[PDB]
């Protein structure tokens, strides 16, 4: 009955819960979300997983498995009735509105509506202000967390949410721990995220996870041997923990300890083989490694040096190709791979690789960006074919046109624009691409009369028709 999962719906979108918090699945990879939730919940104690099988069951759903969906919330009540509290029922909410949700969706609504009964009779013996949901700093730590995992475009609500907690325990652990992290993750340098940071690991003194997160600010800030002070603090307690080994890895791996970083790396690998994020860092290790042998020889090895050249790179292709196969959404391996065959003049691999990640739809717009980006870079200075590098630097600001890339984007298409002028009138593809980045920088006359050319050429076009359109708006 279309009628009853509308009416019972409309109690749904009151809750507080993942599936109310605007999480959208097109921001993410969802293989890799759950690759490092998993990872995250490794040999960590029990009563620390409660958000994470939370988020868990959201991501499952997401994936078209809402039975592993209802294994997550079995485990997060499980873990709720393990803490024995008079803070229970309070703490069962999020809990609670997952399972009314997944429920839902699999067309079992008289559950789902046990677990709205139970929700709202909470809100109501509580006297809350609202039906169906209660103001909780513990909900709002939790939403934090759901975000901050939903990748860059949640971290400034992510923020939001950890300070609203903070507004109520401004010395509560956890809150401060999710708090700094965000604003680290904001910092990607800046370093606002020290002082925060400080604190947390001063509220966490057995904490590894935020302690690796320090170390790494304070290496970003050339605090070095601070921040290895505190990767040695923590490697004992480590050793089966992936999650926070990789991020150890990547401090030894930008202080140039290869060996130590790859130490590390084994290690998360043989907890969670299936990891394409694990086997991408791998590959990021030999690859920087070679880069530097190649470096201090001036691009000729001999000897050892030729030989050591020679194994990194075979590893590096082997990894990034691991990492591809365990996620074919991983997109950072495609580009990794194919820009190492670029490089190594192996252009028509470069191509396959390439040509692969260019067809890939489900994968979010900022890998899009970049993929687009580096085949334009590909086709500029190695192909030589200055019009398929525009039109692809023109897709790049098409997908996303506020980036850290936007200027690079911007002055590349002038220039190669600029020299298709030397011999021969602007193609279509030049047009476009100066309409495009003329009407972006706010020059409307100038845009206007690069899209009226475009068009002159293409009449039928409805890009330039849409781009005329709107041009004709402005003054």
Excluded at 349 to 372: G, P, V, W
């Amino acid at each position: 009955s279309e009628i009853r999962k509308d009416t019972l719906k409309a109690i749904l979108l009151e809750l507080e819960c993942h599936f109310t918090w605007n999480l959208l699945k097109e921001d993410i990879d969802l293989f890799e979300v759950e690759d490092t939730i998993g990872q995250q919940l490794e040999f960590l104690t029990t009563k620390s997983r409660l958000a994470l099988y939370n988020l868990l069951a959201y991501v499952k759903h997401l994936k078209g498995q809402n039975k592993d969906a209802l294994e997550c919330l079995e485990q997060a009540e499980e873990i709720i009735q393990q803490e024995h509290s008079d803070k229970e029922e309070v703490r069962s909410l999020v809990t609670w509105g997952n399972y009314a949700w997944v429920y839902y969706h699999m067309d079992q609504l008289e559950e789902a509506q046990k677990y709205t009964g139970k929700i709202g009779n909470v809100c109501k013996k509580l006297s809350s202000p609202s039906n169906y949901k209660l103001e909780c700093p513990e909900t709002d730590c939790e939403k934090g967390w759901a975000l901050l995992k939903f990748g860059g475009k949640y971290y400034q609500k992510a923020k939001a949410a950890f300070e609203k907690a903070l507004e109520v325990e401004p010395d509560n652990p956890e809150f401060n721990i999710g708090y700094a992290i965000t604003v680290y993750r904001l910092d990607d340098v800046k370093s606002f995220s020290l002082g925060p940071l400080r604190k947390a690991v001063t509220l966490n003194p057995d904490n590894s996870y935020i302690k690796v997160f320090l170390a790494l600010k304070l290496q970003d800030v050339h605090a070095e041997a601070e921040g290895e002070k505190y990767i040695e603090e923590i490697l004992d307690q480590i050793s089966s923990q992936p999650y926070v080994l990789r991020y150890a890895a990547k401090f030894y791996r930008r202080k140039n300890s290869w060996n130590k970083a790859l130490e590390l790396l084994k290690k998360a690998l043989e907890v969670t083989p299936t990891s394409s994020f694990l086997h991408h860092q791998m590959g990021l290790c030999y690859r920087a490694q070679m880069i530097q042998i190649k470096k201090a020889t001036h691009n000729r090895p001999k000897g050892k040096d030729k030989l050591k050249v020679d194994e990194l790179i075979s590893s590096a292709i082997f990894h990034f190709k691991a990492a591809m196969e365990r996620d074919s959404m991983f997109a950072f391996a495609y580009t990794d791979l194919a820009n190492m065959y670029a490089e190594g003049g192996q252009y028509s691999n470069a191509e396959d690789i390439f040509r692969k990640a260019l067809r890939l739809e489900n994968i979010t717009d900022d890998h899009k960006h970049q993929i687009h980006y580096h085949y334009g870079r590909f086709q500029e200075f190695h192909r030589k074919s200055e019009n398929t590098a525009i039109h692809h630097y023109l897709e790049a600001l098409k997908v996303k046109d506020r980036s850290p890339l936007r200027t690079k984007l911007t002055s590349a298409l002038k220039k190669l624009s600029t020299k298709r002028l030397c011999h021969n009138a602007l193609d279509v593809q030049s047009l476009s691409a100066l309409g495009f980045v003329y009407k972006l920088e706010g020059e409307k006359r100038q845009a206007a009369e690069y899209y009226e050319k475009a068009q002159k050429i293409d009449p039928e076009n409805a890009e330039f028709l849409t781009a005329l359109c709107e041009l004709r708006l402005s003054i």
